[PDB]
Amino acid sequence: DLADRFAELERRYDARLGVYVPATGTTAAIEYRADERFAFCSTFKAPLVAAVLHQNPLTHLDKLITYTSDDIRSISPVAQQHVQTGMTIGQLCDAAIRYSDGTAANLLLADLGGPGGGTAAFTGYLRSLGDTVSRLDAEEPELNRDPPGDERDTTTPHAIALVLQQLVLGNALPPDKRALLTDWMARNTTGAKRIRAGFPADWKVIDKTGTGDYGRANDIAVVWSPTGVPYVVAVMSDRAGGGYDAEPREALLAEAATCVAGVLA
Ligand SMILES: CO/N=C(\C(=O)N[C@@H]1C(=O)N2C(C(=O)O)=C(CSc3nc(=O)c(=O)[nH]n3C)CS[C@H]12)c1csc(N)n1
């Protein structure tokens, strides 16, 4: 009945819903439109932070990066206060994940591929995880403005949920580096009304949101249950048929998260 419930969500919210839950030894593969392309939006900041962690030692997180206020071309709540202080790489990893700081990710792309090779290097790191489907072609602010049907700056629920299963549950990131990535998204202050809102209180949730034009609202997440069985949940949606200013529906992802909680009892 999962398909009949997920299509009702699309009928009631006027949007396209895509979900993917990787199979386990116990659970099966919960998939709805999981192989169609949705915009990354801010969801790419979580594997971009891990890209900085893999390519650099822990001593690199304390490197002072000096940016200007003219480098602030995107919604960047944390980089707005440290215009003259600069910020260490570990602090921009905190901003790009916990607060989805746009300027953080932009200079995070610079530290990875240089002034003009950041998006290609972030895409190459996803290839190193086995993800040959996702692609990042624009930086902030343009990666959230691509027209519907455009393949640029897109991933799939299947692709990004597989990637996060290697980031949080896999052995792509070493223990100590994995511990700070798991701590960063578990401190996130952007996804309270999304996947968290769909799973009960004694279920542990760690997530990274994404929101953009054409009613885009995403939230990639790994959920933990009271017994401890881990699950990766990827809820991506958009409301293309409403214009660039179509309002995203945060209750949509919560409802989809309630449905995947009902099959994970
Ligand atoms: C050019 O960039 N345009 C953006 C944009 O910066 N997108 C990013 C993205 O995915 N972001 C996220 C997030 O973490 O998910 C969000 C959504 S989370 C959120 N935080 C708050 O503090 C709050 O009061 N309300 N909400 C909803 C902010 S924008 C950034 C945008 C956002 S909505 C829209 N029409 N455009």
CATH number of the domain where residue 161 is located: 3.40.710.10
- 251 CB-contact burial (10 Å; exposed 0-12 / middle 13-18 / buried 19+): middle
CA dist 46 and 219 (Å) reads 11
Q: Which two tokens stand for residue 119?
A: 């998006």
Q: Which two tokens stand for residue 175?
A: 């223990």
- Quick one: resolution in A? 1.8
- Domain ranges, residue 264: 1-265
Is residue 139 part of the annotated active site? The answer reads no
Sequential DSSP letters for the chain: -HHHHHHHHHHHHTSEEEEEE---SSS--EEESTTS-EE-GGGGHHHHHHHHHHHS-GGGGG-EE---STT--S--TTTTT-TTT-EEHHHHHHIIIII--HHHHHHHHHHHH-SS-HHHHHHHHHHHTT--S-B----TTGGG-PPTT--TTEE-HHHHHHHHIIIIISSSS-HHHHHHHHHHHHT-SS-TTTHHHHS-TTSEEEEEEEEETTTEEEEEEEEE-TT--EEEEEEEEE--TT-TTPPP-HHHHHHHHHHHHHT--
Query: Residues near 103 by Cβ (< 8 Å), separated by ≥ 6?
Result: 67, 71, 72, 73, 74, 76, 79, 140
CB 157 within 8 A of CB 19: yes
CA 190 → CA 27, 43, 67, 223, distances in Å?
28, 11, 24, 16
Candidates 221, 174, 197; CA nearest to 46 is: 221
Whether 141 lines ligand 1, by a CB cut-off of 6 Å, is yes
Whether 76 lines ligand 1, by a CB cut-off of 6 Å, is no
- Which atom belonging to ligand 1 lies closest to the Cα atom of 42? 10
Whether 72 lines ligand 1, by a CB cut-off of 6 Å, is no
CA dist 175 and 177 (Å) reads 6
Q: What angle is formed at CA 68 by the lines to CA 79 and CA 187, rounded to 5 degrees?
A: 10
Write down the residue that tokens 């972030």 correspond to.
122
Q: How far is the CA of 151 from the centre of ligand 1 (A)?
A: 21
CB 181 within 8 A of CB 168: yes
Number of domains observed in the structure of the chain:
1
Q: Which two tokens stand for residue 24?
A: 């386990």
CA dist 43 and 22 (Å) reads 18
Is residue 237 part of the annotated active site? The answer reads no
Whether 103 lines ligand 1, by a CB cut-off of 6 Å, is no
Sheet holding 230-238, edge to edge: 30-32, 16-21, 230-238, 216-224, 204-212
CA dist 103 and 211 (Å) reads 16
CB 32 within 8 A of CB 4: no
CB count within 10 Å of CB 61 equals: 18
Candidates 101, 114, 111; CA nearest to 140 is: 101
CA dist 134 and 174 (Å) reads 23
CB 16 within 8 A of CB 37: no
- Axis-axis angle for helices 45-55, 175-186 (nearest 10): 160
Write down the residue that tokens 């602030």 correspond to.
72
Sign of CA dihedral 196, 98, 169, 118: positive
Q: How far is the CA of 212 from the centre of ligand 1 (A)?
A: 6
CB 109 within 8 A of CB 117: no
Annotated binding site: 100, 209-211
